[PDB]
Structures are given as structure tokens and as C-alpha cells.
């Protein structure tokens, strides 16, 4: 499954990004990460079309109330980076 990632400054913007992602398309929130300096990431999985729609919508909504630092869609994550994703399982 494709992976969608949105990193924001602050928890509230990230919750808003996550809410908008799950509203926009058939994706599942599977990862949540905080690495300090206020950087908070939400991770979703789904088909690549759904993840792209989700991340687009999540970025637009989070930018309305806070700073989006980074966003990313990986259509086919290599099997090793699932070590990092599972490190942030929820």
C-alpha cells in the first residue's frame, strides 16, 4: 500500500491534517510521530490514488491553521522503511 505523510509544526495542525486526510479518501491512519522541535507527522496507507487525494487535502486544510513543514506520497515503499513506519504505529 502507498504511504502518505504530512509533517506539521505543532500537534493541532497535525490532527487537522490527519482529519482532512481521512475525510478526503479511503486511507487509514497507521502512524503518528513526534521527533521534537515541534515537528509532528501523520502517516496514512491506502491505494496510491486515495493517498494522493488524502495528502493534497490534508496539506490544504492544515495550512489554514498552521505550518506544514513537509508532505510526501510514496507509491511503493521499500520493505525496509516499514521498520520506521512500524516504529510509529498507533
Amino acid at each position: 500500500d502507498a504511504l502518505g505523510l504530512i509533517e506539521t509544526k505543532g500537534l493541532v495542525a497535525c490532527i487537522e491534517a490527519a482529519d482532512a486526510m481521512c475525510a478526503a479518501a479511503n486511507v487509514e491512519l497507521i502512524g503518528y510521530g513526534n521527533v521534537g522541535s515541534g515537528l509532528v507527522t501523520a502517516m496514512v496507507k491506502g491505494d496510491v490514488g486515495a493517498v494522493k487525494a488524502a495528502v493534497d487535502s490534508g496539506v490544504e486544510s492544515a495550512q489554514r491553521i498552521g505550518e506544514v513543514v513537509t508532505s510526501l506520497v510514496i507509491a511503493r515503499p521499500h520493505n525496509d522503511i516499514n521498520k520506521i513506519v512500524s516504529h510509529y504505529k498507533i
Copy 2:
């Protein structure tokens, strides 16, 4: 139930935001989060009318003693977002 969120710079401003939210309307404090860089979040739940009144009042009171970084009302949180909220259960 609707979700209300206030993120402040520092713990004292957040406690003031939480106190003002619970004083202003019939909402319950159900989440508390710290993600570093001094960003501290209080989360309340209730009916959307109560949550909106609470967040408005919390932002107004917290801004008197500190910096409110972001605030948010989600009238109908998607079921996946409760994974993040329950991660910050108190």
C-alpha cells in the same frame, strides 16, 4: 462528540487555556499533549456549541498571559483521529 484543541507556548498558558475552556461551557478535558519546542495542547470534548464557546474563551484567556499558537474545533472527528487523541489521554 466535537473536539476542541488549544496549543500554547508553555505549560502555564495551556493550563490557563484548559481552565478557561472548562469554566466557559459543558466540555470535558480529555487530552493533554506536549510535542517539544514548548508547544503544549489541551483537548476537550462536548457538543459542538459547547466546544466552540469553550475554545473561544480558552484562547481569549490564554492570550492574556502567553502565546496561543493554534486553536481548532472539529465538530465531527473522523474515527481514526481518536487514535491520536487517546494517545494523549489523561
Copy 3:
């Protein structure tokens, strides 16, 4: 009981704030919190008159050796913010 809060930049300024609060009036140190970016908070409880005298003195003493980021007296904390205070019990 009333709640008095002083948040400082750094642990040493906070220890000075706590020492001066407890010397200044009949208050008890019941909370200690660190939320990152160097923000350190001391929490005292007592009657509102004692807490007000304590916070005034703690702020004055701490400001001589460091930065006081915020201070607050809540004469009658709502029962819900005790969830946050108990989170930082010491």
C-alpha cells in the same frame, strides 16, 4: 486550594522561583513540569492570599537570575485541570 504557577527558562531559575515561593508564604510545592524548549514550571497550592504573595515573590527572585516566561494564580481551579497538575506531581 488556589494554584500558583511560575514557568522559567531553565531549571536553576525555576528552583529559585520555587524556593522563593515557599519562603514567602504558606504554600506547598506540589507540581514540577518540564515541557521542552527549556521551559520549566513550578506549581504551588495554598489559600489564594498565600499563593498570590508566593507567586509575586517567586517571580521577583527568579527574574534576578533568569527569565520568567509566565506566571499565574488560579484562585479556584476547575476540577478538570487537576488532571494536568497530577500529571506533574512531585
Copy 4:
């Protein structure tokens, strides 16, 4: 085995670096570290040729979406720095 390291600002840039490293050459993701101020590190091991190809590609890809703070290839790590690498083991 040679060690490749990429340190980025933020978790997403690091995931992209790690993905690009593992796609580019026969290396294994063996370490993951976060030391605050938003600094996140991905660590790979393999032969020195594979590790060098991986780090070059990971740096290029991560720089498209974020800040790479530092990157490094150590062809023959001394046995003591594996104490640090094992501290950041990931599975």
C-alpha cells in the same frame, strides 16, 4: 560492513532518504535515530560501493523535499561506534 548515514530536519525527509537509499543499492536499513531539534538519522549497512551509491541517492532525493543536515559514509567503522549504532537499532 560499511555504514551510511543521512541526517535530516524532520521525519518525512528522513523516510524519503531511507527509501531512496534502499532503492538505489544493496544496503539494509539497520539504524534510526532522533536526537532532537528535529534531527533524524537513517543508517544503512552494506559493501562500501553499495553504501556510497545509496547515500548519494538518498541525499539527492531527501533534498528535494527537505533539509539534509549531514551525510557520511564510513567504509570501515571501528568496533566501538557499533555501540552507538546498536543503541539506535530498528526492526
Copy 5:
């Protein structure tokens, strides 16, 4: 017993402050704290004369290699701040 405190930017400066404190006078290293943003504190105890001599020497030596953010001698700590000191026992 008197309390001596030195807060530095960084761990190496703090170790140097602690080394210089213990070399300079008959004090015991009893506390070590890190509160993030790179702020690191060393805490010593002894008689007030020894603690004053120790903190003076620690600040001068640590300032040679790094930033000293704060320093403090408390000749007679109130009983409550030992809650914080023991929290950073080493």
C-alpha cells in the same frame, strides 16, 4: 546543607563545571538535570563557604569552553525544593 547550581548550554560545559566545583571545595555532586534546549545543570551540596567557592570556580572554568546560562547558591534550601533536587538524583 547549602545547594550550588550551575546550568550550561551543553553537556561538556556542564561536566567541566562539575569537575571544577568538586575540585575547588569540599562539596558533593548530588544532582544532574537536563531539561532540553541543551540546558544541563549540575547540583552540589556542602557548607555554604564550600558551595560558594565551588560555584565560583565551576562558572569560571565552564565559561572557558562554553556558555554558562545560570548559577546559584542557596545557603538554606527550603524543604520543598528538595523534592526537585531528589528528582534529579544521580
Copy 6:
């Protein structure tokens, strides 16, 4: 045993400092610490001649790829600072 310390901005620069230290002389890596704001420290022990050679080389190599914030050789650490070193044992 003498103590050598190198504090860098970031984990990768620190690993290079540690690698260069152990390559340069007969020293053992015994401590590893990060205290936030990206400050990461490597600690080595050996005879004062080896530790000095190690720290000089570690600083030169780490400066090629990152910022060295602090470095220090303590030829005869006071017994008390080994409490701090052992706190960062690896």
C-alpha cells in the same frame, strides 16, 4: 583514566568524531549522550596522551562534516563526575 569529550550538532557528526577518536589512539568509547537542541556527545577514556591525540583528531574530522560545539580533555576526572559519565554508559 583521562576523559575525552566531543560535543557536536547532530548525531552523524558525533559518530564521525567517535570514529576518528578511536582510530587516532588507544582510547575506548565509554559514554554517549544527547541533551537536546541537537547536542550529541561522545566520551572516551585512556591515558592522557592517547585521549589528547584522540580528541584533536575527532574534532578535526567532525568539523569536516558538521559543527563541533565543544571539546575537552580532563586528565584526572574527579571521582564525582564519573556519576555523570556512567549515566551515559553504553
